[PDB]
Amino acid sequence: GSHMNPPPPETSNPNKPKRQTNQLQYLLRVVLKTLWKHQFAWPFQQPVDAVKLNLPDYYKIIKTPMDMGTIKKRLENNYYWNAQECIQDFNTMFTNCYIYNKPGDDIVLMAEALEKLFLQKINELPTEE
Numbered sequence: 001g002s003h004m005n006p007p008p009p010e011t012s013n014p015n016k017p018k019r020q021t022n023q024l025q026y027l028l029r030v031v032l033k034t035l036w037k038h039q040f041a042w043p044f045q046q047p048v049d050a051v052k053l054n055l056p057d058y059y060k061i062i063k064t065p066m067d068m069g070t071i072k073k074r075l076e077n078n079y080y081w082n083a084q085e086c087i088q089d090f091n092t093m094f095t096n097c098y099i100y101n102k103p104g105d106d107i108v109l110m111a112e113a114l115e116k117l118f119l120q121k122i123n124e125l126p127t128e129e
């Protein structure tokens with residue numbers, strides 16, 4: 001897309017060691033599945049196109065972008081070694097939302113609803129077997 005948006009996060013790299021764990025399978029099959037289909041998922045399902053949204057400062061402020069489309073592709077591509085890397089991606093996505101926007105903005109309310117659901121799902125994350 002536009003040269004004024006940054007390249008999206010890596011989802012493929014043969015040099016990075018990879019594993020499928022039961023925890024990672026739960027993150028794809030339960031956690032991402034639940035969040036992806038939520039009514040409030042859509043602002044999070046792809047990278048922020050700061051040109052289309054007329055937010056030229058967005059990637060001045062947000063230096064660690066992350067979105068659920070990227071996490072979905074990471075999971076589908078078995079990009080991770082462990083669940084914590086994936087949980088960290090989710091946490092980064094929510095934190096970016098809360099940094100860029102204001103308390104009570106619609107996108108913040110949406111992120112808070114998703115994050116509550118995410119926390120419930122992570123509380124049920126199985127032990128790594």
Ligand SMILES: COc1cc(Br)ccn1
Nearest residue numbers: 043048096097100101107
């Ligand atoms: C209006 O601000 C934002 C913030 C994010 Br994160 C995504 C889209 N718009």
